[PDB]
């Protein structure tokens, strides 16, 4: 199933997968089952390390 | 907190569970000796008339086409 959880409304109840124009149910990167914009920051980092941001193409918030 | 969901899992740093230099991932469809998979390779099997889900380049897991 694309949705972990069969309460979650981004899958289709009878087939637990993303319903019609969805592209994620889940995710840092996830916002009303789409993609979250490519560039939004969505893990702060510290240091001299740059800031984690959403690729435009996944829901997961990825290593930089 | 950590990057690795496992204390296990060898592509985090055990003193911080944070990723070890030069890692992009410790798990996921799209992810290879902790590096993200090429830009395009194919990650899940789509049917009818779908396209293939395929590695971003850019992170590890497998998303949906779009």
């Known amino acids: 199933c694309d949705c972990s959880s069969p309460e979650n409304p981004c899958c289709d109840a009878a087939t637990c997968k993303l ?3 969805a592209q994620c149910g889940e995710g840092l990167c996830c916002e009303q089952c ?3 914009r490519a560039g939004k920051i969505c ?3 510290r240091g001299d390390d740059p800031d984690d941001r ?3 193409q996944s829901a997961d918030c990825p290593r930089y």
């Open 34 to 36: 789409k993609f979250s």
């Open 43 to 45: 893990r702060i980092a």
């Open 54 to 56: 959403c690729t435009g």
């Open 19 to 21: 319903r019609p124009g």
